[PDB]
Amino acid sequence: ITALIVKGSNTERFRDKMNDLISFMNRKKLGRDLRSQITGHVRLQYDSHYTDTVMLQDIPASIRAKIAQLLYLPYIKKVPLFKGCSTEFINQIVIRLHEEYFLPGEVITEQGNVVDHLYFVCEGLLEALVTKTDGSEESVTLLGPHTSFGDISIICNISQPFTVRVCELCHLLRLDKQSFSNILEIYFHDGRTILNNIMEEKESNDRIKKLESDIVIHIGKQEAELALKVNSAAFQGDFYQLKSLIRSGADPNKTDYDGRSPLHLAACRGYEDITLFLIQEGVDVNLKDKFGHTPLFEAVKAGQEGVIGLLVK
Amino acid sequence: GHNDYKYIIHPKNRWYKAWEMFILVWAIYSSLFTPMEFGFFRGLPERLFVLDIVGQIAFLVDIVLQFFVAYRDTQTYRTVYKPTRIAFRYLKSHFLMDFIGCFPWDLIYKASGKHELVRYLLWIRLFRVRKVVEFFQRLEKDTRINYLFTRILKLLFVEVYCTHTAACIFYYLATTLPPENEGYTWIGSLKLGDYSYENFREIDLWKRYTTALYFAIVTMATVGYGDIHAVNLREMIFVMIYVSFDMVLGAYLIGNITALIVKGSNTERFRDKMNDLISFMNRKKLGRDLRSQITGHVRLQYDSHYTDTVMLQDIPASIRAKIAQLLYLPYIKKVPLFKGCSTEFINQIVIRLHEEYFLPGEVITEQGNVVDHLYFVCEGLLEALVTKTDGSEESVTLLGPHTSFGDISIICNISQPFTVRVCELCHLLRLDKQSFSNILEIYFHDGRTILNNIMEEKESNDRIKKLESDIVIHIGKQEAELALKVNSAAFQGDFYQLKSLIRSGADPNKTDYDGRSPLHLAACRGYEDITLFLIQEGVDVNLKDKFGHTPLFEAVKAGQEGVIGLLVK
Amino acid sequence: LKLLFVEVYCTHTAACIFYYLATTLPPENEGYTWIGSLKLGDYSYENFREIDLWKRYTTALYFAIVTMATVGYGDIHAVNLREMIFVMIYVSFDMVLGAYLIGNITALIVKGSNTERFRDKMNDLISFMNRKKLGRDLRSQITGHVRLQYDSHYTDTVMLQDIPASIRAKIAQLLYLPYIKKVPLFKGCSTEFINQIVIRLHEEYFLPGEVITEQGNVVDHLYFVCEGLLEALVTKTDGSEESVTLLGPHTSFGDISIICNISQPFTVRVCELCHLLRLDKQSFSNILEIYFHDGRTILNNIMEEKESNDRIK
Amino acid sequence: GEVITEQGNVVDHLYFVCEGLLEALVTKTDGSEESVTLLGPHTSFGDISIICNISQPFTVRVCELCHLLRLDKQSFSNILEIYFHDGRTILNNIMEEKESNDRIK
């Protein structure tokens, strides 16, 4: 009997968690409203299976990805922003999602604020609020189940369109915007597809199109910018970072805005060993810059007998 | 529904709270008196009849009140004030039991020919003990009293109820037998001292109750003298049931108290670590000053509960951000390394910092050690050490509050060539290497501002001037990429984006890696507006590249007569 | 001990109060008290207020002690309602007291001891050895060494790594540094340097008769003998071992190879005891490579000390 | 399915695949990490990063339960510092064996 009592008690365990957080709040003199917020959400976790997530640590990240695709993926597919988006991007978004529950009244995001988190609503109902001239909320709309907020502040890179506060206990899957945009800068198709899904919203909302994004168009020339960075790295001489840039698929044959390849830069700076490694990758032997120069011209103009000999080879 | 209706009151309302404690008191009486009225009384005498009437009146009013109290719904976690839902909650949870026990069962037994079977419904009133249990639940919710200690207090209360009911039931079993076979009962054959419990229905109520409770209490502790024991088969059977159940209940009491002790206070964990290190002190014959210093860190680990952030992870990241913003932002804004930096970038900093405390004389970072963390100084004072001649006190400036260090190990990928040494208790703030790198890449503008801060910081603070020099190299490095971007923008056609870059402060004259300033590229593209913006900015219009190509050469090579005219102008 | 004192005091006070409640009835009704109606064997406590004090106190304390353990012989029991109520109160509070006594004792046992912690460690080790089916000689060596780890309590130096590196350093500076100063390999050197060596020292106690260093391996640790007598073995390639010298206290083996890039110069066999001080070879390289000129000096120190024995000569 | 190593991340263990089948992967542009090789029993990986003083050139995921043998970067480095010619025999064998799998080739 003593062993089973000592084993644990859910109420007791979350009770120690409250006592520790109370000590923390007391020492740091946290705000009374925020004190209520902490205690309320910790009582919520007493019922929000906080342990499951802590237990998932042992469960391998791949298995966590699969269970994520088993639970979040239906709900996030039903979200209208991701209809017709590549299934790989939605799998990526699902894997990095984090379960977060919220008590009624918890102002999770506030209008015109820095939004680093994109919240997908799964169970619950929320409020859209815009600050009035005096300061009162104007009750824009009610976020029902299976929506997503924080998106406008993220894609449009603007302040939060409206304060979101929940009427009821809700279940939102949090996404930090940093990694989100990073994948957006990788999944180009979903880049443009989410811009189309939000373009319908633009056709319904002026605030969105007001600050449109040129990210995908830049991506059309992101290959040129990458190649620019590669050529700069070849000028740097750091083989590690240079290789990493080539690892990104930066064919040495790719050129900058002026049509200059790393072969020319290796010739210019006497990077004979870089020239050898460019030869392993077979940079276009007579590739011309916008001044019409095959790499012999710079190889000899720098007089790099190693580069001259290698390119004559 | 709080304002939609007026008769409904909050479950935690003040007036209803007073009524709640009053009904708690009355539950304890009506749950500790019903066994007495059942066993010792075969029909209440007409002396406490008004007490029974008032007892049922109080719980009738409780029945009425439980139809006007709101309730926090389990699912929505919001208080629900729907009158129909309030009623449906009460009727389908514990209404019927509380309504049956509200009946005047005394008068029903008196009127119905004393059937003695109706009297058993008095035990339904025991369900009012629910109000006690509920109370203890509320008591276990508050952080005022330990969960285990409230558990043991509840167990003691349960033992009180069980022994009271056992005594009442034992005497009732004595009363089931007719007054002629009383010699075969546990009380009818009792001869404690020289007093004979012969007519055990004529003795005063309190003597009989105290005898029955005496047996129950000694049975509960299983001291079991033997002076009072069971005689009948009914008494034997009930004693066996009660004794087994009390074995289990007392075992739970011992288990709960033992679990409370085994959990222990952090005081004992700290005391025991103190103990094994005191042992080590005596085995190793340590110096007394050293001993006090060891006890120093021991007390620090007892005292510094900074690991509650590991609990804070459960609370959402927005709320965590808010807490960080109000405990770290004032300190971070005063760090000179972040002067000129954007507020969003600083907030993002503040979200990812961790607290760190160290005793005086301790060391956090070390020279020649690859450090993966940036530590800001907020309280206390610190002192790094660049060993230059065999660590001949080759220390570093006393690292005051509102500062930082280890930032150079991140900015220029250095091995952190100084051993920071603690002088007083400091609230150091920890930032991850990958974290700081990625946010730097998000806010490269603010990062360049950061190096523009470090240059002046270390020009006077020569202790980091050497690293400043290396950072100037890295400054050139960032200039390279930034320079290229500027030129790229002018070539790409991003006129407004190029304005944005220069508005952040991008140097326009900056040439690319082959000495081509963005003026060259804009002239080549033919962008009249970009070209005029660049010549206005101050880009050199005459500097040829490393290949003898002046901006005029770009203008005429591209043949853009507008750009040629602007450049000649 | 405090709880046992509470037990003793409570039983003594309970016996005194019980006898007092026997005295709260006039001698007319002594037969209705607990002691007045007491007839044990042949002695009748009829005129109990006239019996000798130590004959009444011992009886009352006998009742109290018996009820304290709840053995409840029943020969002495409560008769009055006064005594009934008091015995109820005492029995309940004694039940709580005994629960606390069992809880305190159980907590002390549950807390365990280095004996049981060692026992656990040994059980896992031998479980591992049989799991991987080692040989009895090898198992003997591991078990002997771990037993010695317990008996030397250098398994209990594991707690000091929790203590600050500065405080650990000073503890080492007071304990290890005495032996290290007497090691001529470090003679002539800055106190700071030997100080660092002592900072990175590890206590390594070994079997009195054993082998810890062999010849031709790659040095990874330096063992300064501070306690016990060891020996240096040079096994001739014909198949016969030869002990070159004895590696006693204040003598160092391994350092010769550690300083240079040569392999292990000789075997070491321990004879008397082995409180060895381990210094990681790679760590010794670190403290040499900081280059405070002390490495350059110890080079000369080795040069002057390379006449110890024919092997090193 | 465990991620043993990662491409571009320096790893300081030369694991010796000994009990099981591995799934050493290589991330491509499309986002799918194409396997550099499925290390089966009595195989090996990690030396390529160590001996060449580089990061791991492949993100290693796992096919089946794999028992492995850790060997520290610095220690092995110290070992090859003393034993160099043996290391040179390693380089010969790495060339000849990598011929087999064009991915490790």
From Swiss-Prot, chain C:
Localisation: Membrane
Signal peptide: none
Bilayer-spanning residue ranges: 3-23, 85-105
Binding annotation for a nucleoside 3',5'-cyclic phosphate: 185-307
Intramembrane segments of this protein: 59-78
The keyword Membrane is annotated on this UniProt entry: yes
GO biological process, one term: response to calcium ion
Subcellular location, principal: membrane
Expression across tissues: Expressed in guard cell-containing tissues, in root epidermal cells and in root hairs. Detected in vascular cells of the root and shoot.
Gene Ontology CC annotations of this record: monoatomic ion channel complex; nucleus
Topological domain ranges for the Extracellular compartment: 24-58, 79-84
Record keywords, A-Z: ANK repeat, Ion channel, Ion transport, Membrane, Potassium, Potassium channel, Potassium transport, Repeat, Transmembrane, Transmembrane helix, Transport, Voltage-gated channel
General function of this protein: Major selective outward-rectifying potassium channel of the guard cell membrane. Involved in regulation of stomatal movements according to the water status. Assuming opened or closed conformations in response to the voltage difference across the membrane, the channel is activated by depolarization. Conductance of the channel is modulated in a potassium-dependent fashion. May interact with the cytoskeleton or with regulatory proteins.
Record's protein name: Potassium channel GORK
